[PDB]
Design a protein around this ligand. Structure first.
Ligand SMILES: OC[C@H]1O[C@H](O[C@H]2[C@H](O)[C@@H](O)[C@H](OCCCCC3CCCCC3)O[C@@H]2CO)[C@H](O)[C@@H](O)[C@@H]1O
Ligand SMILES: [Zn+2]
Lengths: 133, 8
């Protein structure tokens, strides 16, 4: 097993971002606990306080063409969601898969996902999905 | 590696 690395969900976004480090923590009077995180490739202006249970987890992993078969329907995926204004990684679920015929070099499978945020759906290739460990 | 995200 490799050393655990993490991603965290931004409150000004709802997308998930690789975490560079955890600076400190705090406990609100409600009892709510939060850690302060630094996002990889970002200066300290972008640091956030996030809940550990809902907004921090093990990094999603890009899936190799060779293992597309491990991905299944109903699965949770970190999906690179391309739009005009923003391109970002959001959670989604696999509604359907159309399998394809391909060598390990490249995957031509088609995954239909439902984004958790809005419930909207999009079809994605392997290149835009990551799997949970 | 992941796709290079671009923020709003
Ligand atoms: O799920 C779990 C997951 O299993 C667990 O590893 C994850 O751990 C998150 C730990 C966050 C704090 C920790 C402090 C030391 C440096 C690394 C970050 O929390 C998730 C909360 O839902
Ligand atoms: Zn495939």
């Amino acid at each position: 097993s490799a050393d655990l690395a993490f991603e965290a969900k931004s409150a000004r976004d709802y997308a998930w971002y690789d975490v560079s480090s955890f600076l400190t923590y705090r406990v609100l009077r409600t009892g709510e606990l939060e850690v302060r995180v630094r996002f990889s490739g970002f200066d300290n202006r972008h640091d956030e306080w996030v809940n550990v249970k809902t907004s921090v987890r093990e990094r999603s992993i890009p899936v190799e063409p060779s293992e597309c078969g491990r991905v299944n329907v109903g699965d949770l995926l970190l999906c690179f969601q391309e739009r005009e204004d923003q391109a970002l990684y959001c959670d989604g679920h696999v509604l359907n898969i159309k399998r394809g015929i391909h060598d390990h070099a490249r995957c031509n499978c088609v995954f239909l996902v439902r984004y958790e945020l809005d419930n909207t759906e999009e079809s994605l290739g392997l290149e835009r999905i990551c799997r949970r460990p | 590696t992941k796709q290079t995200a671009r923020k709003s």
